Amino acid sequence: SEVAHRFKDLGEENFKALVLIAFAQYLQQCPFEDHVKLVNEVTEFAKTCVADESAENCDKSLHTLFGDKLCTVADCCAKQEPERNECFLQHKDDNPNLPRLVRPEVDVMCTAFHDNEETFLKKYLYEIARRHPYFYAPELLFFAKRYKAAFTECCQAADKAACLLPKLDELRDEGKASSAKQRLKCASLQKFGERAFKAWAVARLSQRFPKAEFAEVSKLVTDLTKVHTECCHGDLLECADDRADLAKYICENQDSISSKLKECCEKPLLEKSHCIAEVENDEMPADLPSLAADFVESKDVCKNYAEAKDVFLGMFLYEYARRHPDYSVVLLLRLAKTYETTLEKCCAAADPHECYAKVFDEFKPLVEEPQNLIKQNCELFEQLGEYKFQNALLVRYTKKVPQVSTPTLVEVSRNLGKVGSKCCKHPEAKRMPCAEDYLSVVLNQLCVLHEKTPVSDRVTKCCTESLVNRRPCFSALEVDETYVPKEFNAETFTFHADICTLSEKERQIKKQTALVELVKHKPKATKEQLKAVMDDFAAFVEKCCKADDKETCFAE
Numbered sequence: 001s002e003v004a005h006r007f008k009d010l011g012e013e014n015f016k017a018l019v020l021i022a023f024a025q026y027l028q029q030c031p032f033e034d035h036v037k038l039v040n041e042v043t044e045f046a047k048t049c050v051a052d053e054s055a056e057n058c059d060k061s062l063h064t065l066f067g068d069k070l071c072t073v074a075d076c077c078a079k080q081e082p083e084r085n086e087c088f089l090q091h092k093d094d095n096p097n098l099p100r101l102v103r104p105e106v107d108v109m110c111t112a113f114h115d116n117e118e119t120f121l122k123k124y125l126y127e128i129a130r131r132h133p134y135f136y137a138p139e140l141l142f143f144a145k146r147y148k149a150a151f152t153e154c155c156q157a158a159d160k161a162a163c164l165l166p167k168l169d170e171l172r173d174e175g176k177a178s179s180a181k182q183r184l185k186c187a188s189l190q191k192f193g194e195r196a197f198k199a200w201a202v203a204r205l206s207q208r209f210p211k212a213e214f215a216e217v218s219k220l221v222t223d224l225t226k227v228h229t230e231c232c233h234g235d236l237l238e239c240a241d242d243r244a245d246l247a248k249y250i251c252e253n254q255d256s257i258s259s260k261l262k263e264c265c266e267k268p269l270l271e272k273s274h275c276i277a278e279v280e281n282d283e284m285p286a287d288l289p290s291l292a293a294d295f296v297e298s299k300d301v302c303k304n305y306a307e308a309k310d311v312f313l314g315m316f317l318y319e320y321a322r323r324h325p326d327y328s329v330v331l332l333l334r335l336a337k338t339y340e341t342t343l344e345k346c347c348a349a350a351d352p353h354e355c356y357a358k359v360f361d362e363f364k365p366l367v368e369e370p371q372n373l374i375k376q377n378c379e380l381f382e383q384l385g386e387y388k389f390q391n392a393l394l395v396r397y398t399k400k401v402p403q404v405s406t407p408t409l410v411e412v413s414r415n416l417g418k419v420g421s422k423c424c425k426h427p428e429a430k431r432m433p434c435a436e437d438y439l440s441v442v443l444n445q446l447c448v449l450h451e452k453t454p455v456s457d458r459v460t461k462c463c464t465e466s467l468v469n470r471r472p473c474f475s476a477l478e479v480d481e482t483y484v485p486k487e488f489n490a491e492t493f494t495f496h497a498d499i500c501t502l503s504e505k506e507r508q509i510k511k512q513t514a515l516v517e518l519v520k521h522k523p524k525a526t527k528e529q530l531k532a533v534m535d536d537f538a539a540f541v542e543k544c545c546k547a548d549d550k551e552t553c554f555a556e
């Protein structure tokens with residue numbers, strides 16, 4: 001019996017939490033109530049399997065169970081595992097048509113919290129999990145514990161509003177970031193594969209643990225991959241389990257891995273795990289040999305490459321990464337691929353050594369591109385400020401892929417612009433990994449949102465073509481020369497007066513949605529003419545909106 005197995009390991013509470021998340025991430029449309037019932041019924045059934053390990057169907061696999069339980073409310077169900085299961089995975093909506101989630105006044109939240117606590121918190125998980133079908137579950141529990149703590153304390157404060165609001169904003173961001181990061185994770189695994197996920201894991205960990213040994217890292221990677229392999233496929237319980245052991249393991253062998261892990265291992269499970277996954281890189285090992293030594297100068301290169309290819313590259317990657325925390329994980333993989341491609345042609349040549357001898361020369365180009373992209377992009381940002389810098393990115397991208405839906409273009413660009421204040425404040429050493437990897441995340445949203453209703457084939461190419469090279473791929477794109485402009489419409493710019501109420505941010509976002517609709521209508525337009533109309537539109541609002549009783553001003 002598996003249900004039993006997992007129950008003993010996670011416990012009543014957590015088992016109850018994870019299972020809620022799984023259902024919320026599968027049938028994002030069903031109401032909170034029907035989820036609860038199924039969660040209990042399923043939990044109930046679990047308690048019996050603990051006693052008798054052969055009762056009803058305690059012998060079955062998780063899926064069969066969870067699958068039939070939902071199939072009592074949910075074509076996915078007209079099949080049988082594994083068929084039945086994966087149908088569900090393919091139907092997770094990344095942009096569900098759920099209603100905006102507004103928050104009642106502070107007083108209500110606190111009463112609702114104080115009265116019933118469990119429900120309050122289960123509601124929390126239900127909402128986040130149904131809107132972010134890929135949210136790294138184990139991690140969601142961490143945010144839940146943090147969420148409870150937010151209220152547990154703020155509600156006994158004086159000015160609750162003052163104490164909560166902030167902590168609440170801090171969680172929306174951090175939780176939003178967490179979700180993107182993981183969506184990329186899953187996307188890697190599901191679209192590109194374990195190997196892909198593995199390489200990324202190798203470089204990234206190797207960067208954080210310069211002192212760990214290739215054989216040590218490789219272990220951490222083989223395990224990590226499994227966690228995520230698991231979490232993404234919906235095996236949320238096993239993911240949470242395995243993830244825990246992995247944390248137990250990293251803490252036990254601390255000395256073999258990093259010296260910054262101390263503070264992480266001296267904390268509760270949940271916080272322990274979050275701490276590790278976010279720890280800063282360990283200091284770099286003192287006297288380290290030159291890469292050129294074993295990977296370009298040695299005459300035994302091609303041989304080793306032929307004996308254990310994947311291992312060799314893994315070593316190459318590990319060795320370059322560990323000593324280059326100032327590069328982004330994508331630049332590394334990129335270099336690593338350049339190396340592999342070279343060995344391939346060079347090894348089947350007359351005098352291999354002479355062929356692959358000047359390989360580091362070809363890295364120079366790939367290494368500067370990002371650096372220049374970053375210097376440039378920050379200089380600009382530094383002069384325009386965040387809002388104007390986003391606008392710069394909004395025009396640029398819209399001209400690039402005019403087909404994309406204005407809403408997507410607005411969010412993506414806004415996000416892309418956040419990189420400015422998110423990274424440009426760091427010294428050159430930490431700027432690239434900060435910047436280019438953050439971009440690969442944002443670009444992944446765009447890729448997934450698009451994937452739903454693919455309209456631009458230029459976006460499709462860049463996205464499917466190569467994971468590691470997307471950011472470059474998009475930067476290539478200039479302006480679509482086949483795009484035949486849109487024709488003004490009224491149904492395209494509903495202006496009804498409900499716009500003098502909205503928050504400041506809600507304004508910019510409207511002033512932004514406009515800017516895109518403009519360019520969508522006048523690509524050939526110029527960055528000079530552009531701001532001129534944009535400025536007139538701002539007056540109309542300012543006008544009409546505080547122009548006595550006028551909903552017609554909008555027409556006039």
Ligand SMILES: CC(=O)O[C@H]1C[C@@]2(C)[C@@H](C[C@@H](O)[C@H]3[C@@]4(C)CC[C@@H](O)[C@@H](C)[C@@H]4CC[C@@]32C)/C1=C(\CCC=C(C)C)C(=O)O
Nearest residue numbers: 101102103104109112120121123124127128171172175176
């Ligand atoms: C405007 C605002 O402040 O919204 C906040 C406030 C918010 C709607 C929150 C998401 C979720 O907890 C909400 C529920 C329904 C959660 C369950 C119950 O306990 C409610 C009594 C509670 C009230 C509003 C709250 C607390 C917010 C979010 C979501 C961001 C988070 C992530 C991971 C993407 C937000 O900041 O956008």
Ligand SMILES: CC(=O)O[C@H]1C[C@@]2(C)[C@@H](C[C@@H](O)[C@H]3[C@@]4(C)CC[C@@H](O)[C@@H](C)[C@@H]4CC[C@@]32C)/C1=C(\CCC=C(C)C)C(=O)O
Nearest residue numbers: 499500507508510511512514537538539541542543545546
């Ligand atoms: C330059 C600037 O900051 O303008 C901002 C500021 C702005 C002129 C605003 C439109 C409108 O509320 C304005 C009125 C007259 C609304 C009625 C009253 O309460 C005034 C006391 C108020 C002051 C200025 C304000 C708040 C802006 C807009 C319009 C954007 C809205 C949408 C839907 C695209 C803008 O960002 O362009």
